[PDB]
Each structure stands twice: as C-alpha cells, then as structure tokens.
Short mmCIF file of C-alpha atoms and ligand atoms in Angstrom, two decimals:
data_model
loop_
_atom_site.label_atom_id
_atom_site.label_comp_id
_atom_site.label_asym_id
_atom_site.label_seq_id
_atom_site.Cartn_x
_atom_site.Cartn_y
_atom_site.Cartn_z
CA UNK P 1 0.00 0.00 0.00
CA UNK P 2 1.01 3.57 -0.42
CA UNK P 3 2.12 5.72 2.41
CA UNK P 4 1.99 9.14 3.81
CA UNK P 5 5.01 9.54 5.86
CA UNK P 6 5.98 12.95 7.01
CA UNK P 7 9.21 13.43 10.14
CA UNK P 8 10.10 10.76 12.04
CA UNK P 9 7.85 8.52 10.34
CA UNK P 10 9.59 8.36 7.43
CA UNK P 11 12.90 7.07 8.77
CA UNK P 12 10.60 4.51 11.19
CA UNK P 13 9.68 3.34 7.62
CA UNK P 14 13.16 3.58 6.25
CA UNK P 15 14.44 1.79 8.94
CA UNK P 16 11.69 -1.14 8.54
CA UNK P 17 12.30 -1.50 4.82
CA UNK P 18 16.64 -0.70 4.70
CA UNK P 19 17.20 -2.86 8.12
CA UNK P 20 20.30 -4.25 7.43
CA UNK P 21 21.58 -2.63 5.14
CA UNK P 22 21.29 0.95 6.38
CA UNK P 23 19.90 3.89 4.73
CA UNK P 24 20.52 7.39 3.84
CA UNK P 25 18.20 10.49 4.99
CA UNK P 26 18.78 12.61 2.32
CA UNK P 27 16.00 15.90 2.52
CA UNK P 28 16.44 19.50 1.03
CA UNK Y 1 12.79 14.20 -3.50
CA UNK Y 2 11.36 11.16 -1.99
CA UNK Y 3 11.70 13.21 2.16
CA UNK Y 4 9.09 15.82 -0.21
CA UNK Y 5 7.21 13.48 -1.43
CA UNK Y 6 6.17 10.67 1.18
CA UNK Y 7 4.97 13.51 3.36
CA UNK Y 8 3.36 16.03 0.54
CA UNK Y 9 1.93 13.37 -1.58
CA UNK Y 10 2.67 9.66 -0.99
CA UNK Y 11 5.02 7.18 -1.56
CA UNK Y 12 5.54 3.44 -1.49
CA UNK Y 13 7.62 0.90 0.41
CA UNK Y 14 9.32 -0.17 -2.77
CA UNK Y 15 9.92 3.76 -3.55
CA UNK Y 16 11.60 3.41 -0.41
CA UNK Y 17 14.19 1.11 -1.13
CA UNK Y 18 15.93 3.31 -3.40
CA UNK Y 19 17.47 4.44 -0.21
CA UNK Y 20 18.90 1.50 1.26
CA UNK Y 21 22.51 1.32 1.06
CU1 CU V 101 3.31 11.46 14.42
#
C-alpha cells in the first residue's frame, strides 16, 4: 500500500524496509 | 525528493528502497 510519511515517520519506515543494510536520509 | 514526497503526496515501500545502502 502507499504511504503518507511525514518526520520521524519516514525514517521509522526507512528503517523497517533498509534494516540491514542501512539507509541514507537525504532531505532538502 | 522522496523526504518531499512521502509527506506532501505519498510514496511506497518499494519507492523506499531506493534508499537502502
Ligand atoms: Cu506522528
């Protein structure tokens, strides 16, 4: 399903799908 | 980018994995 993920929700969510493997927060 | 767009429109999980390292 799509998501609306705004703040700390977003890297909650990039967290759950990256685990592992670690992610990069990258805004403007 | 995708920080813009998951929280002004939406975005997917799979959109999401184009962040992973
Ligand atoms: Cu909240």
């Amino acid at each position: 399903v799509n998501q609306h993920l705004c703040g700390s929700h977003l890297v909650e969510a990039l967290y759950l799908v990256c685990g592992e493997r670690g992610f990069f927060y990258t805004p403007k | 980018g995708i920080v813009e767009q998951c929280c002004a429109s939406v975005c997917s999980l799979y959109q999401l994995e184009n962040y992973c390292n």
